[PDB]
Amino acid sequence: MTVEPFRNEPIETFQTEEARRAMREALRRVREEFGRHYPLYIGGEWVDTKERMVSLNPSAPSEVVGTTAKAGKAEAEAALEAAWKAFKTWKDWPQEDRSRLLLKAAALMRRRKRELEATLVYEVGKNWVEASADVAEAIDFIEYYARAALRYRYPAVEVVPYPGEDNESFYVPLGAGVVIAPWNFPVAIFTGMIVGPVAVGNTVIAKPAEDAVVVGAKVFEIFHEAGFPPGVVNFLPGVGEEVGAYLVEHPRIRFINFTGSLEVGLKIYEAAGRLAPGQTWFKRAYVETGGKDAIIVDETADFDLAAEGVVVSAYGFQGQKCSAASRLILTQGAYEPVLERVLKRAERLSVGPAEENPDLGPVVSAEQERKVLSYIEIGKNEGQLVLGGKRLEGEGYFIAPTVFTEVPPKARIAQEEIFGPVLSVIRVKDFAEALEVANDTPYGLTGGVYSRKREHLEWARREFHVGNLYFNRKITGALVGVQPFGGFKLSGTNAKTGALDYLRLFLEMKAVAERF
Amino acid sequence: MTVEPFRNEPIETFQTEEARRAMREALRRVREEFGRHYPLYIGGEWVDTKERMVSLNPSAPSEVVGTTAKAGKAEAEAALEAAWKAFKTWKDWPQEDRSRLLLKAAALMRRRKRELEATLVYEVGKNWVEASADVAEAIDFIEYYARAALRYRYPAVEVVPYPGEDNESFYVPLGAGVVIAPWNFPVAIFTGMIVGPVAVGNTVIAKPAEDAVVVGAKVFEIFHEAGFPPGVVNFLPGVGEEVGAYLVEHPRIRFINFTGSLEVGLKIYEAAGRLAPGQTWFKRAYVETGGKDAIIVDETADFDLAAEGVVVSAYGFQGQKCSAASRLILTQGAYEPVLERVLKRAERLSVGPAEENPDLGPVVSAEQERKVLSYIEIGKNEGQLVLGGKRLEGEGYFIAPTVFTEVPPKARIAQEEIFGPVLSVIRVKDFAEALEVANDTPYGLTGGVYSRKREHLEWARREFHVGNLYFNRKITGALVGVQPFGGFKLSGTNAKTGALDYLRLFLEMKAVAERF
Amino acid sequence: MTVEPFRNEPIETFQTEEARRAMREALRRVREEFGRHYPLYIGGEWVDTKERMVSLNPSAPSEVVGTTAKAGKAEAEAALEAAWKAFKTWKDWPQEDRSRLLLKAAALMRRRKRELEATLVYEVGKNWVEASADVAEAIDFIEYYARAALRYRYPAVEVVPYPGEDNESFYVPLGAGVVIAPWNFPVAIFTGMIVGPVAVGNTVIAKPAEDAVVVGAKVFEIFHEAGFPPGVVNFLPGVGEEVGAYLVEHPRIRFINFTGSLEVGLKIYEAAGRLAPGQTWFKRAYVETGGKDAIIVDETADFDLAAEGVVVSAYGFQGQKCSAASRLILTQGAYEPVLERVLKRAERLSVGPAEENPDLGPVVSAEQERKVLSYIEIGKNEGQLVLGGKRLEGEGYFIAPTVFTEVPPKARIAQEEIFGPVLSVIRVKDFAEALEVANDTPYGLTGGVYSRKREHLEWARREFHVGNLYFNRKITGALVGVQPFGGFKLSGTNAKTGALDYLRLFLEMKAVAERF
Ligand SMILES: [Cl-]
Ligand SMILES: [Cl-]
Ligand SMILES: [Cl-]
């Protein structure tokens, strides 16, 4: 290697005066910047449009964080032309050259770290630390994929030799594809889904989520300054069901990288399986679709340690994470002790404008608020409400940390992804039944077990069917490189991000033999 | 990694009827082409000249084996322009591509093996087996270097990482250089010295020895058919002192790869150290300059095995090898037993036209004959002639296997390289004195020890100062890859051919750092 | 390994009170030591002489930092006898034993770090940080070569196996050689050129530069305390053209390791190519001969970052570095913005006695002052003087940072190494022409490019023909292990210091086969 061994970007806690000072100034500059307009980015240049996308401050929705241009079918076609044209030469860049480009991008992102975090606080309502972890993760994706990509450099395939011939197998990129990102990790997942494919030679048209178009534009400012060739990466903020669907169904889109709801993921995967008119390849579609994550606690666990991890896992970023603990499965012996600790901890959580660095900020939008409050009403008819369950006063979309107990395993609130600060507690007899209930959902993304009994931990290691399992610690915050992230069942296609395998998904192999 | 592991090309022994049949047919085809004229090869095409070179059959010098063009200064300049023009793009070829080209050349040579061996027999007087080993070695050089070159591909240097930077070191070729080859291994060494530098990106101007211009041209027929780009390899048969010296002293020759006499090697090394008018680099000159190799035998040895190895080493190819055993150092207890056995074996050696596969063919030329006969006369005044020492009947330059005994260590025939079938026998007290006499010459190429005493063998491993040492076996016929070949002291610059280290000599290193 | 992974010795910045305190005390003790006399070091003992070498303080030349004995031909012969005698056994030391000796030497040097830096400040006029980097580099050479040498331990050569035989190839040291060092890095390069050869079994006679004999003696005090066997390393301060030339031309000197001017390097390389009377080997000569290093800046660069790097690169240690940026090539779009920033930065540079830790100390000697002022006069007739260009008031050899602009690419000041604080600015149309001008000098040591355009950086990576290339950072201060140091063309033989390959230059290979 020609760079130092990968290390995860430290997540800022803001305990020191220097950190608080830097963050206050970043928050103030971003705030003073409200209302700014960001154009589309196609073929290496910013391109404006007549229509626009508006991004509001979830902590005070009367405030416009900023606006962006709006991509329709015409802009989609333009981006496609630029991306395919760019692919023609981008695919031939030595891998070392492409990786150095990503490393430059990571360096530029790191320098604008505070600013990006501040933008997350205002645009999507993350408190300070949640914002810091998001940006740190994005930096990690770039650093990790830059190095990982070199493991696939020409000619990387291990083959069996043959007398009188040279037999060489190597990987080549797929082409131009589309990236459709979520709003909950608008810098991290947005960046990761883009730079992975791009690092190995693909070109990308990125479609940021409606609620996070501004931070997406700022990421592209970094790509532009880094110097990615025209067409290699394109920014197309717009409506998913419109320009997003258009690209997914397009005959000239080689692959689709998607992270979001199961509803949309199911549509994309189905569409990808169809041969659009004139299409000349079988589309590849990678989808990460969330889950209904549970944390199990048995009577041998450290109850205080468990309650702490459950609260962090269930309410971090208002429970708006595909990794969030939305289910708490407690064995008979641990039910009371753990539930009482969880409630005492959760009732002390603060809720307020994200800029104030509360424990919980607001949910991301009115629509999200509607969805979460709606599930709370359903919950009142399925389980026992024992904490919160209501909207708080204020313009922002504030929902109090909520807890339902005595919830039936097959209740809607114990099966459907709510994506809000709502925890469903399920009582079970023992560990065996705990695993039963844990596995009995259509998902399989994250999971956790708090227990001191080795046999239960090792049993879960083999039988708790989730892609990311954690013992005696929070089940959120998967670190790039450390914990390959991706699930099973309806949580997606198991495309592990922050793992060597991720890049192989954006490559195809060629075997060339020469008989001398 | 994309081809089978390296293996040495089997040396044909002609023990089967099919092998003999094939050789007889190759000999017929080759002699039926004795009238052919081979032009120069410059910039991808054969270019003829007014003057010419004539090659005779040393087994019947009135018979012409062929003629070639004769390169002068004008042709040297033409080749130089073509080689530098080619270097500009040849240096940028992926190493994998350059290696495949060599592998193709090896495959072609292997298919024309009998034809080349037959040409060696008629042009330089090698018997069948010596001819076969020569061609097999050339094939080995191509196969080995094609593979070794890949160990230096971009970016191959191991460096220490530094924070915030990419530090990449890699190898790059030198440019255009001249290869000046000997007549004793006109296919193997001629091929090795050319393909080694070429394999890693350099371009070469090859100047074959006057006595083997025809077989040198046939090697280029192979290079041409293999498809080396115009200018990469150039064929310039001509007078060493003329065209050879012109290139060596030229300010635009980047390196010189030479194998031949010490006399010429010393001149070349001195010239290489000077800055010619307008020259913009420090020239690298690699010179292998023969030796005065000895085989030591103590009283614990298997005398029959030793006598066999001595005869093989001293008279193989009429002793015209830089590795030939020209000194036989015997301790008191081994003297009589060994000398009598060597004499009995040597007196049974046949001598005659090489095509009849005798034990010994003729020496290569009238000049060589004059030199050898002169040393024989000198020997008569320094030691006691006990075998041979006469020219044999026929126009061919046949000289009988010769043995001198009671030769003083510092005698001219015990110090100077005769390059003929002349073995000097020196008697010593013990092994320690044997090592002292072995080391006391200006040379250090090959050497051997016949003994069963482990302490004597391991002692020699450390104190017998020669680049290639052999225990209880012949000291000639070093195999590519198995025995890196090159010596110490006045035997040259220790450029180990058939070894990974050989290619490093034709590369320079660049270190590029990028601060992100 | 039996030691921790190599890490570069930290370069002291002296920002903390502890560092300033330690340095002030070291400077005071060295100063109080002025006038001390150091003898020659031959055969493990200090040997005085009648004549002496005088070392003055360039910041106040009336002060004698110290004096040393003076080696003539008689002392050279004595050192040669001691070095060859020492080689006899030193070559047989297990590599692990030799490396541990170097590690001990490094530990002793590290403990006397402040003292050595202080000696550099007074003897050669380096400010505090330049002095710190010099000593840190020396420590790095010892630490790096100690480990690197183990990679060559018996039996290190990868060979192809053969049926019924043991085939073992291994490296052995060359013998006793001479090291001729420069005055600009009298601890670093002096140490590196000595310990590299010595680590693998060679013995050395070291000839320090006239202006840095005292610090050279202090290095030998460390070697002595470390315990290198008598004769392994010898200290011979004296006149280069006298005792230096004597050793270079001597028939019993096996190799020459030289760093200095191109004029002397050319003479040494030529002499090394000659066979002195009675010489029994082909001499090896490694020469690093400086350069005419340029930094290129295009219109896409961070002009502030570039101006800062240019000033550090051009004036660090008064531009008395073979790596110093003596040329600034600016494209049309970057000319004005960068030149104005360079001038504003350079005009603020302080000049004064090195002990005061100014930005620039004095040039090293009266002769150097004469040479630099002379080139300034030539510059006034070739380009436009826009800053400095004069001597400052004081006894010390102080020259103001100088800048010439509108300099013709082929002007003497844009082609010849001035080795002073003189920068030549060259205006060009674009990057293509920038590379043209950059490569058009007889040298090829260091180079740099400030640019944000990936295509220009990657183009330079392959076409800016210098051994050490840096992007968006200073082109001086190559770190051992991180950036193999050595150039192309007339900058030397490309012997990369602080790289694994460096040690191979002081070894020759032996292949020993045993047929069972
Ligand atoms: Cl599982
Ligand atoms: Cl030896
Ligand atoms: Cl280069």
mmCIF file of C-alpha atoms in Angstrom, chain B residues 189-422:
data_model
loop_
_atom_site.group_PDB
_atom_site.id
_atom_site.type_symbol
_atom_site.label_atom_id
_atom_site.label_comp_id
_atom_site.label_asym_id
_atom_site.label_seq_id
_atom_site.Cartn_x
_atom_site.Cartn_y
_atom_site.Cartn_z
ATOM 1 C CA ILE B 189 23.633 -15.333 -24.156
ATOM 2 C CA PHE B 190 22.747 -13.297 -27.253
ATOM 3 C CA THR B 191 19.065 -13.918 -26.423
ATOM 4 C CA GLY B 192 19.345 -13.408 -22.665
ATOM 5 C CA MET B 193 21.207 -10.105 -22.811
ATOM 6 C CA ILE B 194 18.615 -8.778 -25.248
ATOM 7 C CA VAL B 195 15.313 -9.949 -23.737
ATOM 8 C CA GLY B 196 16.180 -9.138 -20.128
ATOM 9 C CA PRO B 197 16.372 -5.361 -20.708
ATOM 10 C CA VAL B 198 13.565 -5.428 -23.295
ATOM 11 C CA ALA B 199 11.171 -7.307 -21.038
ATOM 12 C CA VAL B 200 11.014 -4.400 -18.562
ATOM 13 C CA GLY B 201 10.640 -1.555 -21.080
ATOM 14 C CA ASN B 202 14.085 -0.880 -22.576
ATOM 15 C CA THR B 203 14.888 -1.008 -26.309
ATOM 16 C CA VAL B 204 18.055 -2.652 -27.597
ATOM 17 C CA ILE B 205 20.588 -2.564 -30.405
ATOM 18 C CA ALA B 206 22.192 -6.028 -30.592
ATOM 19 C CA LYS B 207 25.687 -6.500 -32.008
ATOM 20 C CA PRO B 208 26.391 -10.243 -32.551
ATOM 21 C CA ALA B 209 29.929 -11.665 -32.520
ATOM 22 C CA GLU B 210 31.536 -11.827 -35.971
ATOM 23 C CA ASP B 211 31.720 -15.644 -35.817
ATOM 24 C CA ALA B 212 28.005 -16.181 -35.193
ATOM 25 C CA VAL B 213 26.214 -13.518 -37.234
ATOM 26 C CA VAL B 214 24.010 -16.050 -39.075
ATOM 27 C CA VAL B 215 22.510 -17.762 -36.032
ATOM 28 C CA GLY B 216 22.134 -14.303 -34.510
ATOM 29 C CA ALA B 217 20.061 -13.310 -37.548
ATOM 30 C CA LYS B 218 17.865 -16.399 -37.173
ATOM 31 C CA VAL B 219 17.098 -15.341 -33.605
ATOM 32 C CA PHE B 220 15.902 -12.028 -35.001
ATOM 33 C CA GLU B 221 13.673 -13.838 -37.492
ATOM 34 C CA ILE B 222 11.942 -15.132 -34.383
ATOM 35 C CA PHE B 223 11.786 -11.655 -32.808
ATOM 36 C CA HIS B 224 10.276 -10.329 -36.037
ATOM 37 C CA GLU B 225 7.603 -13.020 -36.245
ATOM 38 C CA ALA B 226 6.784 -12.577 -32.549
ATOM 39 C CA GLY B 227 5.804 -8.993 -33.301
ATOM 40 C CA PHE B 228 8.112 -6.783 -31.261
ATOM 41 C CA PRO B 229 7.192 -3.186 -32.251
ATOM 42 C CA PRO B 230 9.494 -1.400 -34.757
ATOM 43 C CA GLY B 231 12.677 -0.284 -33.016
ATOM 44 C CA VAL B 232 12.347 -2.345 -29.820
ATOM 45 C CA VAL B 233 15.021 -4.827 -30.953
ATOM 46 C CA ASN B 234 17.622 -4.120 -33.633
ATOM 47 C CA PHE B 235 20.114 -6.457 -35.344
ATOM 48 C CA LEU B 236 23.506 -4.932 -36.221
ATOM 49 C CA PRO B 237 26.133 -7.488 -37.260
ATOM 50 C CA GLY B 238 29.489 -5.763 -37.661
ATOM 51 C CA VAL B 239 33.037 -5.317 -36.378
ATOM 52 C CA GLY B 240 33.198 -5.029 -32.595
ATOM 53 C CA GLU B 241 35.981 -2.438 -32.683
ATOM 54 C CA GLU B 242 34.028 -0.377 -35.188
ATOM 55 C CA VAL B 243 30.273 -0.320 -34.687
ATOM 56 C CA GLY B 244 30.501 -1.849 -31.215
ATOM 57 C CA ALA B 245 32.875 0.808 -29.862
ATOM 58 C CA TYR B 246 30.944 3.567 -31.647
ATOM 59 C CA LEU B 247 27.813 2.672 -29.693
ATOM 60 C CA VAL B 248 29.626 2.126 -26.402
ATOM 61 C CA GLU B 249 31.165 5.616 -26.509
ATOM 62 C CA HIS B 250 28.037 7.268 -27.926
ATOM 63 C CA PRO B 251 26.471 9.994 -25.740
ATOM 64 C CA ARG B 252 22.967 8.690 -26.523
ATOM 65 C CA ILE B 253 23.483 5.068 -25.454
ATOM 66 C CA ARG B 254 21.924 4.646 -21.995
ATOM 67 C CA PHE B 255 23.419 1.268 -21.095
ATOM 68 C CA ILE B 256 25.758 -1.448 -22.334
ATOM 69 C CA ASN B 257 25.231 -5.166 -21.692
ATOM 70 C CA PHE B 258 28.422 -7.016 -22.652
ATOM 71 C CA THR B 259 29.744 -10.580 -22.435
ATOM 72 C CA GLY B 260 33.162 -11.423 -23.854
ATOM 73 C CA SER B 261 36.883 -11.037 -23.212
ATOM 74 C CA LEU B 262 38.346 -9.172 -20.249
ATOM 75 C CA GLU B 263 40.419 -7.062 -22.646
ATOM 76 C CA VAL B 264 37.314 -5.647 -24.310
ATOM 77 C CA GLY B 265 35.313 -5.603 -21.083
ATOM 78 C CA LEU B 266 37.936 -3.386 -19.451
ATOM 79 C CA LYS B 267 37.792 -0.943 -22.381
ATOM 80 C CA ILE B 268 34.004 -0.838 -22.324
ATOM 81 C CA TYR B 269 33.806 -0.288 -18.569
ATOM 82 C CA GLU B 270 36.311 2.542 -18.810
ATOM 83 C CA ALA B 271 34.477 4.162 -21.726
ATOM 84 C CA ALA B 272 31.161 3.803 -19.886
ATOM 85 C CA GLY B 273 32.577 5.820 -17.006
ATOM 86 C CA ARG B 274 33.232 8.862 -19.196
ATOM 87 C CA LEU B 275 30.805 11.647 -20.054
ATOM 88 C CA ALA B 276 30.692 11.830 -23.853
ATOM 89 C CA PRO B 277 30.095 15.303 -25.335
ATOM 90 C CA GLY B 278 26.443 16.197 -24.760
ATOM 91 C CA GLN B 279 25.725 13.035 -22.740
ATOM 92 C CA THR B 280 23.072 13.654 -20.054
ATOM 93 C CA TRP B 281 23.334 10.595 -17.776
ATOM 94 C CA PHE B 282 25.736 8.231 -16.020
ATOM 95 C CA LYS B 283 26.025 5.116 -18.205
ATOM 96 C CA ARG B 284 25.480 1.668 -16.739
ATOM 97 C CA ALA B 285 27.736 -1.025 -18.147
ATOM 98 C CA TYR B 286 27.312 -4.683 -17.236
ATOM 99 C CA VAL B 287 30.238 -6.862 -18.269
ATOM 100 C CA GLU B 288 30.799 -10.609 -17.861
ATOM 101 C CA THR B 289 34.440 -11.268 -18.708
ATOM 102 C CA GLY B 290 35.324 -14.960 -18.447
ATOM 103 C CA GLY B 291 37.600 -16.661 -15.945
ATOM 104 C CA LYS B 292 40.358 -19.130 -15.049
ATOM 105 C CA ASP B 293 38.140 -21.686 -13.325
ATOM 106 C CA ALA B 294 39.433 -24.530 -11.223
ATOM 107 C CA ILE B 295 38.196 -27.840 -9.891
ATOM 108 C CA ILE B 296 39.702 -28.988 -6.595
ATOM 109 C CA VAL B 297 39.799 -32.671 -5.660
ATOM 110 C CA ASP B 298 40.943 -33.989 -2.283
ATOM 111 C CA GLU B 299 41.792 -37.540 -1.219
ATOM 112 C CA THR B 300 38.287 -38.236 0.148
ATOM 113 C CA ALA B 301 36.603 -37.828 -3.234
ATOM 114 C CA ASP B 302 35.054 -40.347 -5.608
ATOM 115 C CA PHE B 303 37.921 -40.232 -8.115
ATOM 116 C CA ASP B 304 35.943 -41.750 -10.989
ATOM 117 C CA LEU B 305 33.116 -39.246 -10.537
ATOM 118 C CA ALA B 306 35.681 -36.433 -10.331
ATOM 119 C CA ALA B 307 37.637 -37.463 -13.442
ATOM 120 C CA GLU B 308 34.339 -37.641 -15.312
ATOM 121 C CA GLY B 309 33.305 -34.149 -14.181
ATOM 122 C CA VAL B 310 36.742 -32.713 -14.898
ATOM 123 C CA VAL B 311 36.791 -34.003 -18.471
ATOM 124 C CA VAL B 312 33.254 -32.757 -19.044
ATOM 125 C CA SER B 313 34.088 -29.319 -17.601
ATOM 126 C CA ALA B 314 37.452 -28.896 -19.337
ATOM 127 C CA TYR B 315 36.612 -30.134 -22.825
ATOM 128 C CA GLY B 316 32.898 -29.474 -23.264
ATOM 129 C CA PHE B 317 32.603 -27.368 -26.416
ATOM 130 C CA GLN B 318 36.370 -27.623 -26.735
ATOM 131 C CA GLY B 319 36.887 -25.662 -23.503
ATOM 132 C CA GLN B 320 35.610 -22.464 -25.130
ATOM 133 C CA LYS B 321 33.523 -21.486 -22.105
ATOM 134 C CA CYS B 322 33.960 -18.770 -19.463
ATOM 135 C CA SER B 323 33.015 -21.553 -17.039
ATOM 136 C CA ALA B 324 35.369 -24.194 -18.427
ATOM 137 C CA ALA B 325 37.590 -25.988 -15.937
ATOM 138 C CA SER B 326 41.062 -24.894 -17.067
ATOM 139 C CA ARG B 327 42.774 -25.693 -13.774
ATOM 140 C CA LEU B 328 42.753 -28.979 -11.882
ATOM 141 C CA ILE B 329 44.032 -28.553 -8.338
ATOM 142 C CA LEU B 330 44.854 -31.874 -6.678
ATOM 143 C CA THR B 331 46.012 -32.521 -3.131
ATOM 144 C CA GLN B 332 48.858 -34.996 -2.541
ATOM 145 C CA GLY B 333 46.605 -37.955 -1.790
ATOM 146 C CA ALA B 334 44.395 -37.439 -4.826
ATOM 147 C CA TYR B 335 46.990 -36.445 -7.435
ATOM 148 C CA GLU B 336 47.924 -39.833 -8.942
ATOM 149 C CA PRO B 337 44.494 -41.540 -8.656
ATOM 150 C CA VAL B 338 42.720 -38.586 -10.238
ATOM 151 C CA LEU B 339 45.260 -37.597 -12.896
ATOM 152 C CA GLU B 340 45.552 -41.149 -14.237
ATOM 153 C CA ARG B 341 41.763 -41.387 -14.520
ATOM 154 C CA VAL B 342 41.492 -37.982 -16.207
ATOM 155 C CA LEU B 343 44.181 -39.006 -18.706
ATOM 156 C CA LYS B 344 42.508 -42.346 -19.465
ATOM 157 C CA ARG B 345 39.170 -40.621 -20.113
ATOM 158 C CA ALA B 346 40.563 -37.676 -22.065
ATOM 159 C CA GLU B 347 42.612 -39.883 -24.409
ATOM 160 C CA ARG B 348 39.381 -41.613 -25.421
ATOM 161 C CA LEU B 349 37.708 -38.369 -26.552
ATOM 162 C CA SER B 350 36.906 -38.112 -30.243
ATOM 163 C CA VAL B 351 37.601 -34.971 -32.285
ATOM 164 C CA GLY B 352 36.197 -34.050 -35.693
ATOM 165 C CA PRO B 353 33.405 -32.287 -37.655
ATOM 166 C CA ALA B 354 30.755 -31.145 -35.148
ATOM 167 C CA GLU B 355 27.857 -32.447 -37.237
ATOM 168 C CA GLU B 356 29.054 -36.018 -36.543
ATOM 169 C CA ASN B 357 28.477 -35.306 -32.850
ATOM 170 C CA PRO B 358 32.075 -35.925 -31.708
ATOM 171 C CA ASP B 359 33.156 -35.352 -28.111
ATOM 172 C CA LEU B 360 34.979 -32.299 -29.458
ATOM 173 C CA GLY B 361 34.419 -30.246 -32.564
ATOM 174 C CA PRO B 362 36.920 -27.653 -33.842
ATOM 175 C CA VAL B 363 37.751 -24.346 -32.158
ATOM 176 C CA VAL B 364 35.692 -21.500 -33.689
ATOM 177 C CA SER B 365 38.210 -19.843 -36.010
ATOM 178 C CA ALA B 366 41.714 -19.535 -37.427
ATOM 179 C CA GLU B 367 42.389 -16.755 -34.899
ATOM 180 C CA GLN B 368 41.182 -18.873 -31.985
ATOM 181 C CA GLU B 369 43.347 -21.718 -33.289
ATOM 182 C CA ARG B 370 46.384 -19.423 -33.399
ATOM 183 C CA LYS B 371 45.707 -18.229 -29.836
ATOM 184 C CA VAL B 372 45.290 -21.741 -28.425
ATOM 185 C CA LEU B 373 48.330 -23.138 -30.229
ATOM 186 C CA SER B 374 50.330 -20.174 -28.878
ATOM 187 C CA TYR B 375 49.348 -20.912 -25.280
ATOM 188 C CA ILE B 376 50.253 -24.544 -25.869
ATOM 189 C CA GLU B 377 53.779 -23.478 -26.883
ATOM 190 C CA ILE B 378 53.952 -21.225 -23.815
ATOM 191 C CA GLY B 379 52.798 -24.143 -21.675
ATOM 192 C CA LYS B 380 55.600 -26.365 -22.985
ATOM 193 C CA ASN B 381 58.008 -23.934 -21.320
ATOM 194 C CA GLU B 382 56.037 -23.650 -18.080
ATOM 195 C CA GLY B 383 54.744 -27.148 -17.432
ATOM 196 C CA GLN B 384 54.996 -30.756 -18.581
ATOM 197 C CA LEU B 385 52.877 -31.754 -21.584
ATOM 198 C CA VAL B 386 51.425 -35.224 -20.982
ATOM 199 C CA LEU B 387 48.532 -35.292 -23.439
ATOM 200 C CA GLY B 388 47.566 -33.725 -26.758
ATOM 201 C CA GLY B 389 48.970 -30.294 -27.538
ATOM 202 C CA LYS B 390 48.757 -30.697 -31.306
ATOM 203 C CA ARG B 391 46.616 -29.461 -34.168
ATOM 204 C CA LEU B 392 44.778 -32.388 -35.776
ATOM 205 C CA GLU B 393 44.406 -33.324 -39.465
ATOM 206 C CA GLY B 394 41.908 -31.473 -41.642
ATOM 207 C CA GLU B 395 41.153 -27.924 -42.748
ATOM 208 C CA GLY B 396 38.791 -27.619 -39.787
ATOM 209 C CA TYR B 397 40.407 -26.121 -36.673
ATOM 210 C CA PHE B 398 40.742 -29.359 -34.714
ATOM 211 C CA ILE B 399 42.931 -29.244 -31.606
ATOM 212 C CA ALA B 400 43.469 -32.285 -29.396
ATOM 213 C CA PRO B 401 42.397 -32.408 -25.717
ATOM 214 C CA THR B 402 45.494 -31.129 -23.922
ATOM 215 C CA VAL B 403 46.867 -31.663 -20.424
ATOM 216 C CA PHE B 404 49.897 -30.033 -18.752
ATOM 217 C CA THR B 405 51.120 -31.160 -15.329
ATOM 218 C CA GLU B 406 53.523 -29.752 -12.747
ATOM 219 C CA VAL B 407 52.265 -26.300 -13.709
ATOM 220 C CA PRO B 408 53.388 -23.535 -11.321
ATOM 221 C CA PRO B 409 50.356 -21.643 -9.871
ATOM 222 C CA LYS B 410 51.631 -18.332 -11.227
ATOM 223 C CA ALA B 411 52.472 -19.692 -14.681
ATOM 224 C CA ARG B 412 50.800 -17.940 -17.621
ATOM 225 C CA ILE B 413 48.750 -21.039 -18.505
ATOM 226 C CA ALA B 414 47.611 -21.187 -14.875
ATOM 227 C CA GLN B 415 46.598 -17.532 -14.873
ATOM 228 C CA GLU B 416 45.417 -16.493 -18.335
ATOM 229 C CA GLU B 417 42.194 -17.609 -20.024
ATOM 230 C CA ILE B 418 43.137 -19.781 -23.003
ATOM 231 C CA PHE B 419 39.559 -20.595 -24.058
ATOM 232 C CA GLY B 420 40.568 -23.898 -25.607
ATOM 233 C CA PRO B 421 40.853 -27.625 -24.714
ATOM 234 C CA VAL B 422 43.819 -27.049 -22.394
#
